[PDB]
Design a binder for this molecule. Structure first.
Ligand SMILES: CCc1ccccc1-c1ccc(C(=O)O)s1
Ligand SMILES: [Cl-]
Ligand SMILES: [Cl-]
Ligand SMILES: [Cl-]
Length: 256
């Protein structure tokens, strides 16, 4: 009847409540995951039945406004959202994905597909701000939830909507994909801090597909060619194998 729902509120959010939330999100993403090896592999999109394809993340704030994000279990990424009686989707990359999203929010009166995709390069263009200048934390997420809701009423302009997607995607999708990024959000919540992600976080986000490829194509957990990541200060270093990454990457897109 309905896809699995995970609830989170910014209202009185704690390190523990955020941890419980990301744990529950990874739980629903990995129901059909390959968990035989050191790092979970999300299910292959090829031949995945439609009734296993999505999970719903219902977000609430101090204002008790609620939006529901749809996440694709094959890549943990946001494909669209519902606010009241309206649903909004990123432009699908192909006809199969366009058909898949017709199964989301089947109830809603108003369905809209954005002209644009949900990739960071495009969202940063629409927001007029790079990830390095968009603060993350409980405050940004509370504001993002209100902005996503008030898009449905005409109260939110597209640049603020795009900025709000950048906040939600990093604090939910990227936190689910990477223990390192979950921990970055735990630190911000603990200290009631709002701060932009440093180069270590941004390079990790940028590298998710490349890391999923290198790990799954590895010779007994040794890479064909090394992958470059960044330290907090932006200095580059090489990763030659999966070993150092098991604590850092929680979920991988199917590769082969
Ligand atoms: C996420 C990048 C990463 C991957 C694997 C192992 C270590 C790292 C570092 C993050 C920050 C570092 C620093 O500031 O020195 S090093
Ligand atoms: Cl649709
Ligand atoms: Cl900027
Ligand atoms: Cl180091």
């Amino acid at each position: 009847k309905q896809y699995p729902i995970i609830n989170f509120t910014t209202a009185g959010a704690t390190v523990q409540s955020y941890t419980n939330f990301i744990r529950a999100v990874r739980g629903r993403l990995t129901t059909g995951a390959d968990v035989r090896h050191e790092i979970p592999v999300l299910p292959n999109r090829v031949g995945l039945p439609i009734n296993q394809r999505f999970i719903l993340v219902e977000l609430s704030n101090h204002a008790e406004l609620s939006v529901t994000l749809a996440l694709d279990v094959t890549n943990a990424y946001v494909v669209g959202y519902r606010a009241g009686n309206s649903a909004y989707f990123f432009h699908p990359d192909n006809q199969e994905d366009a058909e898949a999203i017709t199964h989301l929010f089947t109830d809603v009166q108003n369905r809209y597909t954005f002209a644009f995709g949900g990739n960071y390069d495009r969202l940063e263009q629409l927001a007029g701000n790079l990830r390095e200048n968009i603060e993350l934390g409980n405050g940004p997420l509370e504001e993002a939830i209100s902005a996503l809701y008030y898009y449905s009423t005409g109260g939110t302009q597209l640049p603020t909507l795009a900025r709000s997607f950048i906040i939600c995607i990093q604090m939910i999708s990227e936190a689910a994909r990477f223990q390192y990024i979950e921990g970055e959000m735990r630190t911000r919540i603990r200290y009631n801090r709002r701060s932009a992600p440093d180069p270590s976080v941004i390079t990790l986000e940028n590298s998710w597909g490349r890391l999923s490829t290198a790990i799954q194509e590895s010779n007994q957990g040794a890479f064909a060619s090394p992958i470059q990541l960044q330290r907090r200060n932006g200095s580059k270093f090489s990763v030659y194998d999966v070993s150092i990454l098991i604590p850092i990457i929680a979920l991988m897109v199917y590769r082969c």
